[PDB]
Amino acid sequence: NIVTLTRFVMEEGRKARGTGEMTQLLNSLCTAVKAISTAVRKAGILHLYGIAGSTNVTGDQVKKLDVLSNDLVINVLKSSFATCVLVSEEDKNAIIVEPEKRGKYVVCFDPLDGSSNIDCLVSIGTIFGIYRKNSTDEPSEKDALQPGRNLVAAGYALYGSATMLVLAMVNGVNCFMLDPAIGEFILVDRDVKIKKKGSIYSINEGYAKEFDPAITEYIQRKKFPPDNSAPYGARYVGSMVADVHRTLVYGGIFMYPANKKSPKGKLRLLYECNPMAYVMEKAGGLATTGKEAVLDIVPTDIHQRAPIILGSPEDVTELLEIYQKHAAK
Amino acid sequence: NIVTLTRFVMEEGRKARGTGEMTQLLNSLCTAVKAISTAVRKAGILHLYGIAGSTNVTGDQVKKLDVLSNDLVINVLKSSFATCVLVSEEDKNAIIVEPEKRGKYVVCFDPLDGSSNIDCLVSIGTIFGIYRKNSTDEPSEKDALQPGRNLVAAGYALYGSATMLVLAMVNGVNCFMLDPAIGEFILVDRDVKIKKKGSIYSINEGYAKEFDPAITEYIQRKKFPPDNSAPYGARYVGSMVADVHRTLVYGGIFMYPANKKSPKGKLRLLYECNPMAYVMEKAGGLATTGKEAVLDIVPTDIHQRAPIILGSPEDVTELLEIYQKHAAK
Amino acid sequence: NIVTLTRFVMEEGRKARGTGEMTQLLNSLCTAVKAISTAVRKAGILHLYGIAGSTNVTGDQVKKLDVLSNDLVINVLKSSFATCVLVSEEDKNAIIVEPEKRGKYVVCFDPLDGSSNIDCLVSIGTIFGIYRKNSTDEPSEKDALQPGRNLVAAGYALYGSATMLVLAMVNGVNCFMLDPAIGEFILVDRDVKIKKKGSIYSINEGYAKEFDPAITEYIQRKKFPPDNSAPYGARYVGSMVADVHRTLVYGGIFMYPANKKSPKGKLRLLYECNPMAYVMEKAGGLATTGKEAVLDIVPTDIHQRAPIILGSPEDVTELLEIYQKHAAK
Amino acid sequence: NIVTLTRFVMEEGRKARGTGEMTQLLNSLCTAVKAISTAVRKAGILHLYGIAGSTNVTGDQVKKLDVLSNDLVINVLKSSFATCVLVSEEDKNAIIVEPEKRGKYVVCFDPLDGSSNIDCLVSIGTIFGIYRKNSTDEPSEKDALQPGRNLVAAGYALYGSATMLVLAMVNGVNCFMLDPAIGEFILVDRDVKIKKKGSIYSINEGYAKEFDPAITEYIQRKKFPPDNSAPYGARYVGSMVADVHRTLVYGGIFMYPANKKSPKGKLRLLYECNPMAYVMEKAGGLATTGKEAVLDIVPTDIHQRAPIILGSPEDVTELLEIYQKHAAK
Ligand SMILES: Nc1ncnc2c1ncn2[C@@H]1O[C@H](COP(=O)(O)O)[C@@H](O)[C@H]1O
Ligand SMILES: Nc1ncnc2c1ncn2[C@@H]1O[C@H](COP(=O)(O)O)[C@@H](O)[C@H]1O
Ligand SMILES: Nc1ncnc2c1ncn2[C@@H]1O[C@H](COP(=O)(O)O)[C@@H](O)[C@H]1O
Ligand SMILES: Nc1ncnc2c1ncn2[C@@H]1O[C@H](COP(=O)(O)O)[C@@H](O)[C@H]1O
Ligand SMILES: O=P(O)(O)OC[C@H]1O[C@](O)(CO)[C@@H](O)[C@@H]1O
Ligand SMILES: O=P(O)(O)OC[C@H]1O[C@](O)(CO)[C@@H](O)[C@@H]1O
Ligand SMILES: O=P(O)(O)OC[C@H]1O[C@](O)(CO)[C@@H](O)[C@@H]1O
Ligand SMILES: O=P(O)(O)OC[C@H]1O[C@](O)(CO)[C@@H](O)[C@@H]1O
Ligand SMILES: [Mg+2]
Ligand SMILES: [Mg+2]
Ligand SMILES: [Mg+2]
Ligand SMILES: [Mg+2]
């Protein structure tokens, strides 16, 4: 037997005895992902066929994939009639859905993460976080400022050697791989659980001069294990989706802490950190800022940044112990 | 207008007054690359059918798509009636082509490079180097033990966010992107030249305790520039084709020097180092082991390894100077 | 805005306040169609790659597309958990679904009609008819012997110049075209209605010597209009799905009456005639055996044959008047 | 092994000691055919964006995919640098290639044949005929007014249940099927030969009142065989490429003789009749107007029409004998 994302989502909706609004929401996001996947695998042939350049300027008629993807996602969520407020990396303010197409869900997303490095063909992806409209007030961007802990569903689509949709909900994480021949996501990893301890650390060491004492010490341990065990391997694709997915599948740790130029980290809280933290915790892993759990942070701005350390529970705990080791001696 | 790889190869063969053998050899590689690309984009799906039940156990790594990809390349190369000797990373001995299908080219290739990175969907690729049999003797392993400097054609196929075929010949380097809809590689970057100086360094710093003094001093200088400039950003996909292609496009430096387990480096000279070195040099970059030019090494073993440092000339030269500074002490 | 089959079916299910069982059934049939479409567009490359021949013999390991498609459809309907009894052109007896995967729906289908002429690449398709389990008895093939008039849903997938899924339900006929790039059926014709009168007649005239008086007279009228109007055009693809779809879109009439070798017509009642009659009537057209409406026939055998005349209401009525013109003078 | 069209063409060019111009011309056609095929399989979708609002109105028929397909062929042919004169069914005058892109071949083609059959998704195709400029003069329309007998290459692409490219040259006829997954045409039928006698006749019998005595007597004989054999089955897709390809594969006869509106037939001699006639003859079949061989007609108008009867030799000869029997009275 083979399970398609479409069937899995439908059956989960039925068991949840939902009204079918969330199901439509997920179906819509899935369709969006397939369209973005198709475009990504041919990005260079589009950004050139219809004029091009070397700079980074988007217009009206001819716009980059980044804008395209964002337009596609928004259009599909508004058409699902399941949302009321949308938050995107590409929009300064939150998008309030038209009353006539208004649903009860709030969606935070990164339409095409790592796109800034699409030129070198490195993996890129789409990150999403879904919230249930809490208050009865009129839809507003405050509705998208709920802590990750209130997430009903979260995940990402990774456009790497293959395209994958990782979906996490209250009962677990499942990975579905896209078969481009039939346009169907096939379940290939059920109820994923990250291993307790890994052997790979992921961080941009070019910021070494700006790292805090704890991180500086942790990296040294990975290279020079005091107990003389085997040093960890290092991997840093430069694309959050790619690095996190590898962490999820092979275990280990991924880090993007605060430093000099980034006193509060670089990764965005609403559509980058929370979703990834949610997937991690649902997989038995940890996601912390180094002092507090990411999902517990109280968001104050939709574009707020946040430090993030995540991955295997033992590796993250080890780093947590180092942070605790530092303070006011 | 829009130039397809098929048209570009044919016209180059015509200008060179070739008998068509090499043109046919290249046509065959392109076809094989498309087939591998299609398989890669759904590798996880092709699987799932009762494998065994492994987790880590340091041992077997031979994946199914690895062998199939190899068999495809071999079958396609023999069928081209343009080769006499084949060297694959998957075959312990050189493959000698039967008399009837024998041509005059020697092909060294890595069918599907990027081992520890398919299960996590990291970018992977196919690497190739082509030599003209420089002998009147009966075809044998010796015909493949030529220095990279003798290559008449070299390149790689990168299965990343998109699929790219990069071809380098005497005339220079060109990048063609695969449009999966029509099965045609479209020329998207002509006569590629590498940036004289980059701002990214690429290496697995996990082997830090095993690095020689030159590499060690170099890494520190990238993190703590003595001239107080902005430090280099770090990137290491863990897939040679992915890391090298980013070096080609964004510039900078890629490094895989000798370490404990790899006293002479890890990367294979014939089908990993040489092709990448040839591409870099045709693009105006440099490829050194730290002491000598990769392309000028005369191999004695088809599976011989070699340390490699490649990328922007100013970046590679700066490291070269460190090496000779220490050697001058 | 653009409507996908997936969304249309979901929204229709919700408005119908269904439990989601029929929705899953249609989603499953849709997925099946995409897989069959993919195989059909490459049929000749499969029936050859894995051995071949000229005869018509299927085995165990290597079976023809016909069997493949049938295996795919059955497997997908049993996995939808929405059916209890299945009737296929390829199976002598009805298939009683396993209790554990038993649903309330009865499905009659022609997995790959016109496949016998796949060799010439003529259009082929998949026909389906869906019934609601009436009695409370144990599932049996008598459950599939309901008159077409009891159809809840019916339609077909046409694999022609493009792939199309035509779905008919109580409120109308809608056509969705498959976009092979994203694996999605896009709504392209809403609530289809056949024109009142056409200008094309479709029948195999090679059976002229075996036609009854009425049909012989009707064909003469189309070629030699008594009122000297323009003679109708003739079209006969030889594939029911193709001929009917054209009739639906361009109007006119399609005929496969009884003759010599076929005293009761050739086309099957359960998975060929009824579904097409249902689509026709739902589109404002007519489907008659020449004396009685197809949907009103009381099926007595799952493989029963039946004469069928269908298409524009005025063209079919005209022929009905001719039949009435003949009897016992 | 598996032979791709790309490899088959190249090797044939090599055996012929061609300079590569014709090989490049054929490579270009193949690429264009793949692009048209992809568009065709989703033509209905490419549309939908505010056309106008027509129903029947005997007038405009020029579809959008018709022009785009034509522009593609032209652009692709000029870019091949192998042609000097082009004749398209869509251009009122011959297209003369600019000096810089001028080669020595003349190409007559029908970009997307199958007018009254795309909206109903009937099979459609692309037809082509290639001539060597047999003149030292300045390229002009005259270079295309050669008799079919002078063709150096002819064929068609059929977008049916699958996409097939049929190529005929002095050596014979070969059929290649397009694998849309890898964008390669696979040789599936080598040195095709037509059945000496078929059991299918193909004609639009709607013009019955306009048929000459020979065609009339022939049709009756197919329905009421004087030797009491089984009558021929009838087939008429309404798309020349579809009907002709079935004639090639199953054998039999295809007919489109002169009628009222078409006193000299409907089908175009240069880019419809001749290519199909050349294919038939290279396959051992016959192609006649009823009085003379299609390939021996010297055209005087590039858009000239001609009656055509083609297919199995015994079937075509039997009709030929009827024609001469009447002419002998
Ligand atoms: N497809 C689904 N998968 C998982 N949980 C679902 C699904 N549909 C609905 N639910 C759950 O049921 C709640 C109500 O669904 P709805 O009526 O569609 O808004 C959602 O907020 C989820 O907690
Ligand atoms: N398609 C081509 N592109 C570039 N150089 C070519 C091509 N075909 C032939 N050559 C050159 O011509 C030499 C002889 O080609 P061949 O006769 O095909 O073995 C090759 O070794 C190349 O140096
Ligand atoms: N997706 C749907 N589209 C149209 N009608 C539907 C749909 N789902 C359910 N229905 C109608 O509601 C009935 C009960 O649905 P169910 O509970 O799924 O068996 C069906 O027999 C149909 O008449
Ligand atoms: N690919 C090919 N297949 C078949 N015949 C070819 C091919 N290439 C060249 N020829 C033959 O050689 C002649 C001269 O080719 P060219 O020098 O390319 O114009 C053509 O007109 C054909 O008769
Ligand atoms: O170059 P840096 O500072 O390491 O940033 C890399 C990070 O930036 C992002 O692109 C954020 O958009 C992430 O995908 C990635 O992890
Ligand atoms: O894990 P390590 O030691 O950094 O090695 C990674 C390298 O190995 C390979 O996977 C093959 O040797 C390369 O693609 C990659 O550059
Ligand atoms: O060759 P005949 O007798 O006209 O039969 C054609 C009919 O047979 C079928 O193939 C039945 O399987 C129909 O698709 C088609 O309409
Ligand atoms: O409708 P008619 O007169 O039979 O003509 C159909 C013929 O016309 C064409 O559509 C083009 O003239 C051919 O493809 C087909 O054979
Ligand atoms: Mg981002
Ligand atoms: Mg390798
Ligand atoms: Mg049938
Ligand atoms: Mg035409």
Residue D8's CATH number: 3.30.540.10
Candidates D284, B43, D94; CA nearest to A178 is B43
Question: Is D236 annotated as belonging to a binding site?
Answer: yes
Decide if A184 and C182 are in contact by the 8 Å CB cutoff.
no
D309 and D171 together in one domain: no
Last residue of a domain, one of A134, A160, A191: A191
**DSSP one-letter string for D73-85:** HHHHHHHTT-EEE
CA distances from D12 to D8, D153, D187 (A): 6, 12, 14
Closest residue on chain D to C232 (Cα):
D206
For residue C308, list its beta bridge partners: C256
CA contacts within 13 A on the Cβ side of C250? 24
Between the CA of residue D238 and those of C246, D118, D196, what are the distances in Å? 11, 11, 24
The pair of structure tokens assigned to B328 is 């001058």
Tell me, yes or no, whether A120 and A257 share the same domain.
no
| Dihedral sign computed on CA atoms, order C143, C146, C152, C156 | positive
The values of phi and psi at residue B177, to 5°, are -100, 135
Both tokens of residue D7? 């490899």
**Euclidean distance between the first and final Cα of chain B, in Å?**
57
Alpha-carbon distance D174 to nearest alpha carbon in chain B (angstroms):
19
Here the tokens at position B138 are: 């009966």
Residue D56: Cβ within 10 Å count: 9
Is B35 in the same domain as B165?
A: yes
Ligand positioned closest to the Cα atom of C257: 7
The first and second tokens of residue C198, run together, are 């056409």
The Cβ-side half-sphere exposure at C105, using a 13 Å CA radius, reads 27
Please enumerate in sequence order all residues whose Cβ is within 8 A of that of B203, keeping only pairs 6 or more positions apart, or say none.
Answer: B215, B219, B236, B254, B255, B256, B257
Q: Using alpha carbons, select from D274, D267, D201 the residue that is nearest to residue D232.
A: D201
Closest CA to B128 of B160, B91, B71, B88: B88
Structure determination technique employed? X-ray
Which ligand is the nearest neighbour of the Cα of A126?
A: 9
Dist CA B98 CA B94 (whole Å)? 13
Cβ–Cβ gap D223/C208 under 8 Å? yes
- C76 and C206 assigned to the same domain: no
Chains sharing 3 or more CB pairs under 8 A with chain B: A, D
Strand pairing partners for C158? C125, C164
- Do residue C79 and residue A4 have CB atoms under 8 angstroms apart? no
Chain D contact for B42 (CB, 8 A cutoff)? no
Whether residue B238 is found in the same domain as residue B311: yes
B119: closest chain A residue by CA: A249
Same domain, C91 and C197: no
Q: State whether A166 and A274 are in the same domain.
A: no
The DSSP symbol for A170 reads T
Give how far the C-alpha of residue B131 lies from the chain's centroid of Cα atoms, to the nearest Å: 15
- Is the CB of residue B194 less than 8 Å from the CB of residue B251? yes
Same domain? B163 vs B200? no
Residue C254 and residue C280 in contact, taking contact as beta carbons nearer than 8 Å: no
The residue whose CA has the least distance to atom 5 of ligand 6 is B238
Residue with the two structure tokens 């009421």: D224
Ligand 8: distance of its center to the CA of C123 in Å?
17
Distance between CA B133 and CA D267 in Å, rounded?
Answer: 55
Distance CA D93, CA B90 (A): 58
The reply to whether C6 and C89 lie within a common domain is yes
B132: left (phi over 0), alpha (psi -120 to 50) or beta: beta
**Sequence-ordered list of residues with C-beta below 8 angstroms from that of D220, at least 6 positions apart, any chain:** none
C238 CA from centroid of ligand 7 (Å): 5
- Nearest of C296, C293, C316, C328 to residue C215 by alpha carbon: C316
Contact call for residues A269 and A234 (beta carbons, < 8 A): no
User: B265 CA to chain D: closest CA distance, Å?
Assistant: 36
Chain C contact present for D163, CB below 8 A = yes
Q: Residue B303: which residues within 8 A CB-CB, separation 6 or more?
A: B89, B92, B268, B270
Judge contact between A241 and A156, C-beta under 8 A.
yes
Mutating which of A121, A161, A192 best tests the B interface, going by the most B Cβ atoms within 10 A?
Answer: A161
Q: Do B4 and D31 touch (CB under 8 A)?
A: yes
Resolution (A): 2.1
Closest-CA residue to C198 (of C148, C239, C250): C250
Q: To test the ligand 6 pocket, which listed residue (B256, B261, B264) has its Cβ within 8 A of the most ligand atoms? A: B256
Q: How far is CA C319 from CA A153, B323, C192, C224, C295, in A?
A: 60, 95, 23, 15, 18
Same domain, D128 and D38: yes
Looking at residue B273, the DSSP 8-state letter turns out to be I
Q: Of all helices (H) and strands (E), which one includes residue A175?
A: strand A172-179
Size (chain A), residues: 329
The enclosing domain of C292 has a CATH number of 3.40.190.80
Which tokens belong to B106? Answer: 């020697």
In this structure, the answer to whether residues B200 and B259 fall within a common structural domain is yes
Which protein residue has the closest C-alpha to ligand 1 atom 12?
A: A18
Residue C165 sits in the same domain as residue C292: no
The answer for residues whose C-beta is within 8 angstroms of residue B20's C-beta and 6 or more apart is B13, D10, D13, D14, D20
Closest partner residue to A122 among B40, B205, B246, by Cβ? Answer: B246
Contacts of A207 in chain B (CB under 8 A): 231
Question: Exposure pattern of D64-83 as b/e (b: 16+ CB <10 Å)?
Answer: ebbebbbebbbebbbbbbbb
CA A328 centroid distance within chain: 34
Nearest-atom index, ligand 2, CA of B171: 4
Name the token pair of C289: 């055996």
A318 is catalytic: no
Distance CA B205, CA A89 (A): 32
Decide: residue D310, CB within 10 A, 0-12 exposed, 13-18 middle, 19+ buried.
buried
Task: Among D131, D163, D191, give the residue marking a domain's end.
Answer: D191
Rounded distance between C-alpha atoms, residue A132 and residue B282, angstroms: 56
By CB atoms closer than 10 A (0-12, 13-18, 19+), residue D118 is buried
CA distance B80 to C111: 40
Q: Tell me the nearest-neighbour CA distance from A34 into chain C, angstroms.
A: 6
CB A295 within 8 A of CB A287: yes
**Does the CB of D28 have a partner CB in chain B at under 8 Å?**
yes
Distance in angstroms (rounded) separating the CA atoms of residues A85 and A131: 10
Any chain C CB within 8 A of the CB of D121?
A: yes
Count of structural domains, chain A: 2
- Secondary structure (3-state) at D95: strand
A189 is catalytic: no
C150 interface with A at CB cutoff 8 Å: no
Q: Render B166-181 in DSSP notation, one character per residue.
A: EEEETTEEEEEEEETT
Of A5, A77, A113, A187, the active-site residue reads A113
| CB contact A186 to B (< 8 Å) | yes
* Among D191, D214, D247, residue at a domain's last position: D191
Rounded CA-CA distance B173/C37 in Å is 40
Ligand index nearest the alpha carbon of residue B241: 6
Nearest alpha carbon to residue D119 among D206, D238, D265: D238
Tell me which residue in D10, D38, D182 faces B20 most closely, judged by beta carbons: D10
Q: Which residues of A touch C7 (CB under 8 A)?
A: 24, 27-28, 31, 79-80
Selected catalytic residue, list B26, B72, B86, B110: B110
Lay out the sheet containing A253-256: strands in order across.
Answer: A233-234, A200-202, A253-256, A308-311, A286-288
Domain span at residue D240 reads 192-326
Rounded to an integer, what distance in angstroms lies between the CA atom of residue A182 and that of residue C34?
Answer: 6
**Integer angstrom CA distances of residue C24 from A10, A38, C80:** 7, 26, 6
User: How far is residue B99's CA from residue B88's CA, in Å, rounded to a whole number?
Assistant: 20
